[PDB]
Design a protein around this ligand. Sequence first.
Ligand SMILES: CC(C)(COP(=O)(O)OP(=O)(O)OC[C@H]1O[C@@H](n2cnc3c(N)ncnc32)[C@H](O)[C@@H]1OP(=O)(O)O)[C@@H](O)C(=O)NCCC(=O)NCCSCC(=O)c1ccccc1
Ligand SMILES: CC(C)(COP(=O)(O)OP(=O)(O)OC[C@H]1O[C@@H](n2cnc3c(N)ncnc32)[C@H](O)[C@@H]1OP(=O)(O)O)[C@@H](O)C(=O)NCCC(=O)NCCSCC(=O)c1ccccc1
Lengths: 136, 136
Amino acid sequence: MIWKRKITLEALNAMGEGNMVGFLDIRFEHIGDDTLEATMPVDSRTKQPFGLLHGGASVVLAESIGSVAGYLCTEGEQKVVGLEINANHVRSAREGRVRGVCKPLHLGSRHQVWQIEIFDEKGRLCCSSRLTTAIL
Amino acid sequence: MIWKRKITLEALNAMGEGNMVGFLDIRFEHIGDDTLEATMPVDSRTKQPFGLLHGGASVVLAESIGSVAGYLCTEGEQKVVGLEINANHVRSAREGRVRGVCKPLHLGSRHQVWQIEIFDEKGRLCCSSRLTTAIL
Ligand SMILES: CC(C)(COP(=O)(O)OP(=O)(O)OC[C@H]1O[C@@H](n2cnc3c(N)ncnc32)[C@H](O)[C@@H]1OP(=O)(O)O)[C@@H](O)C(=O)NCCC(=O)NCCSCC(=O)c1ccccc1
Ligand SMILES: CC(C)(COP(=O)(O)OP(=O)(O)OC[C@H]1O[C@@H](n2cnc3c(N)ncnc32)[C@H](O)[C@@H]1OP(=O)(O)O)[C@@H](O)C(=O)NCCC(=O)NCCSCC(=O)c1ccccc1
């Protein structure tokens, strides 16, 4: 396992309460040995004015999963913040929930790089994102 | 002026009602002859679990301002969608509202590139973002 912190899904989902993660109903659904996965609804809270998933909402999902995964790969009072993030919106979404899957590209002593792919309910890729974190 | 559509600030702000823009109290505040500006609160809707503005929330603001400016530089039934986005989180925001200022880097026939800088209430740069759009 890449993780250094041991956390439960329930405890992970409690982290979002009362901040942006909870307000968008981002739910962590699986902690793998080297992956982290969360879903997010496509509705009035996450759509742009023309009925599509907001490109920024996909990025909120990516930065949420990658930063939390980043945090879980540190120990003690180390913190992890997003330093640079980028994304390509390859397909639009309109309804249902999208699913983000995050895996590590680099786990360094001072920086990390995460890949997050976001899929719709038919399993089609909608967003491909890379997040670089700084360990403080 | 770079705009091809004539829209009022009130009409711009009406676009966000019932979607993510309205949900987050993103408010368009100024249309320049070649800049667009909007603000966004740093609060429970936009913070990450450790009290900072969520890096994804900055990107929601950037993609919101950039995509609308992009749309205003097209005409009739032309649509504008975000294609690629990247952002540098150079300083944390913690309170008040942040202000995004959007300027064109490239305005093309089938694509645009927008620069959006996001400042805190003390005028310090917190996020610097670039959005690439596709015109459909
Ligand atoms: C350091 C990065 C960026 C972040 O991860 P991180 O968490 O921060 O650090 P890591 O723990 O993962 O350890 C990584 C390595 O860094 C070293 N080190 C760490 N801290 C220090 C330190 N305080 N002091 C000294 N060394 C330090 C380690 O010893 C380790 O070394 P090694 O590899 O020999 O075992 C890491 O991802 C990286 O090296 N990316 C490749 C960058 C690249 O090749 N870019 C392209 C080329 S440069 C641009 C260009 O083209 C150019 C053109 C013209 C002119 C000029 C330039
Ligand atoms: C500290 C960074 C990363 C590097 O700084 P740098 O390269 O050296 O550049 P500067 O020298 O200009 O420093 C600038 C200011 O930072 C201060 N400072 C320096 N070191 C520390 C420190 N150890 N502690 C505290 N402050 C420190 C400096 O003193 C200076 O302050 P000042 O001038 O007033 O005295 C800086 O770029 C930054 O904070 N970016 C924002 C990251 C961000 O908010 N991402 C989004 C949120 S996290 C992801 C997320 O959404 C998420 C979601 C779900 C779950 C979890 C998460």
